[PDB]
Amino acid sequence: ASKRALVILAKGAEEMETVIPVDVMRRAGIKVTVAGLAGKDPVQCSRDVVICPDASLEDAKKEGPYDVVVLPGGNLGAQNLSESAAVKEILKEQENRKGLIAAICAGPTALLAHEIGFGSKVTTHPLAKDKMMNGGHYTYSENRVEKDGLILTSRGPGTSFEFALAIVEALNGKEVAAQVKAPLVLK
Amino acid sequence: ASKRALVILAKGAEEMETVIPVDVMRRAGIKVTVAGLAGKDPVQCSRDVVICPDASLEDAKKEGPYDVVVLPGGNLGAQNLSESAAVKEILKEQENRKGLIAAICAGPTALLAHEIGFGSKVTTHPLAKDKMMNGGHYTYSENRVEKDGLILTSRGPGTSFEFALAIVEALNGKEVAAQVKAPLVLK
Ligand SMILES: *[C@@]1(=O)C(=O)N([C][C]C2=[C][C]=[C][C]=[C]2)C2=[C][C]=C(F)[C]=C21
Ligand SMILES: *[C@@]1(=O)C(=O)N([C][C]C2=[C][C]=[C][C]=[C]2)C2=[C][C]=C(F)[C]=C21
Ligand SMILES: [Cl-]
Ligand SMILES: [Cl-]
């Protein structure tokens, strides 16, 4: 049976960090739900790209649980994720059930906000390090992608393909990740 | 004064190849118009990401001309661009006025369809080479980004950052491209 991904899309999300994982995961045969934090309406991303979510978060939650919950970055998107009681509940449920959580750029700071995966080795965007490390709840890494058990983190738009393919490898295996990678013309 | 970019968005466009250049160009302070080929309505991309264009092509044309016209790939998106009389007219005008034209993945095959930039060195996605080379109107390159004067081409999702930054360098210079690049966490 196919694996399922929930991508939580908030105003101010980094659109590259949203679209790259959604696209790459669909290439891998993952069933991806782009879920709007604020409802069903189109979402204005950080660089003004407007994306129409597949569903509201409220609705997508009802079709859970998911094999991965994906948190894009963007400072303002991550703040919105960080402030959301609905995200808190989703992430706590996912952690509790030992499901994967993946977050990129400023996205990992939402893990801090919601007290998720304390003790993990994580990375973030370099500019988000101090926020992530407030209280020393995680151990910091400069790896482009960091995976510490069920906590998978990455750094920025330029690591989005690696992040996405790490998600694919985690859910569908190395061979599928390699197959999906080759047509992308990655360096 | 700020440079201006027209990104032509058709059904079946590769969403990564659309969003990466739009975002990176906006980071560079370029005024970018995402123009829907079919009108003002949301566009269903190749991997089902739905993007709301800033304007119809019809409307965006009226605010021309642009310092660059950008053609994303995706096989079906490129076919739609290739079949469009409106795109033909836009590209001929751009070529005639010696403005930049940039196309990625299968996007360059629209240049062939509309008889644009014959004689140029070009690249495409590897799977789009034979289509592009039908009649030997161009010279083929395996460079990740190829720029032959005002014809700028690239290969796939994995070359989208390089493609975008090449556009930025062409319009705004090497120093701006370097400044925009550094926060992206590119390899
Ligand atoms: C990335 O998508 C993101 O989340 N970034 C924000 C990092 C940050 C900046 C200031 C304070 C806290 C966090 C970010 C920045 C730059 C970039 F290119 C991508 C991203
Ligand atoms: C890319 O975005 C694109 O346009 N691709 C289509 C290439 C092509 C395939 C078959 C026949 C003609 C052209 C393509 C393919 C794979 C990929 F990963 C990205 C793109
Ligand atoms: Cl940001
Ligand atoms: Cl395609």
β B151-154/B145-148 pair status: antiparallel
Cα–Cα distance between A106 and B90 in angstroms, integer?
39
* Structural domains in chain B, sorted by start: 1-187 (3.40.50.880)
Residue appearing with tokens 């590119």: B186
Q: How far is CA B74 from CA B106, B118, B130, B155, B160, in A?
A: 6, 22, 16, 11, 12
Using DSSP, state whether A17 is helix, strand or coil. helix
Cα–Cα distance between B28 and A81 in angstroms, integer?
27
End-to-end CA distance of chain A: 32
Cα dihedral across residues A151, A154, A160, A166: positive or negative: negative
DSSP helix, strand, coil percent of chain B (3-state; round to 5): 40, 20, 35
> In a 10 Å sphere around its CB, with 0-12 CB exposed, 13-18 middle and 19+ buried, how is residue A169 labelled?
buried
Which entry of B52, B114, B125, B137 is annotated as an active-site residue? B125
Cα–Cα distance between A139 and B59 in angstroms, integer?
51
Query: Which DSSP letter does residue A148 get?
Result: E
Half-sphere exposure of A183 (CA within 13 A, CB side): 14
Q: Which of B32, B86, B17, B78 lies closest to B57 in space, CA to CA?
A: B86
| Partner residues linked to B30 by β-bridges | none
B185·A26 Cβ contact <8 A: no
Query: Do the beta carbons of residue A177 and residue A184 sit within 8 Å?
Result: no
* Shortest-distance ligand to the CA of residue B11: 4
Phi, psi angle pair for B23, to nearest 5°: -65, -55
Q: How far is CA B19 from CA A48, B53, B145, B180, in A?
A: 10, 11, 17, 16
Helices (H), chain B: 15-27, 57-62, 75-82, 85-96, 109-113, 129-132, 160-172, 174-181
Cα–Cα distance between B32 and A70 in angstroms, integer?
28
> In a 10 Å sphere around its CB, with 0-12 CB exposed, 13-18 middle and 19+ buried, how is residue A91 labelled?
buried
Phi, psi angle pair for B5, to nearest 5°: -125, 135
A114 carries an active-site annotation: no
- Tell me whether A22 touches chain B (CB under 8 Å): yes
Cα–Cα distance between B108 and B105 in angstroms, integer?
7
Q: How was this structure determined?
A: X-ray
CA of A14 to the centre of ligand 3 (A): 6
Residues B176, B179, B180, B181, Cα dihedral to 10°: 120
Atom in ligand 1 nearest the alpha carbon of residue B27: 18
Q: Which DSSP helix (H) or strand (E) runs through A8?
A: strand A4-9
CB-closest option in A14, A20, A50 to B52: A50
Query: Which DSSP letter does residue A41 get?
Result: S
Cα–Cα distance between A75 and A68 in angstroms, integer?
22
Atom in ligand 1 nearest the alpha carbon of residue A14: 2
Cα–Cα distance between A9 and A107 in angstroms, integer?
11
Give the 3-state DSSP-derived string for B140-168, with helices as H, strands as E and coil as C. Answer: ECCCCEEEECCEEEECCHHHHHHHHHHHH
Using DSSP, state whether A110 is helix, strand or coil. helix
Q: What tokens appear for B8 in the block?
A: 């032509």
Whether cis (ω within 30° of 0) applies to the bond prior to B183 is no
DSSP helix, strand, coil percent of chain A (3-state; round to 5): 40, 20, 35
Q: Which of B122, B96, B93 lies closest to B109 in space, CA to CA?
A: B122
Q: What tokens appear for B19 in the block?
A: 């969003």
Cα–Cα distance between A57 and A59 in angstroms, integer?
5
Query: Do the beta carbons of residue B25 and residue B167 sit within 8 Å?
Result: yes
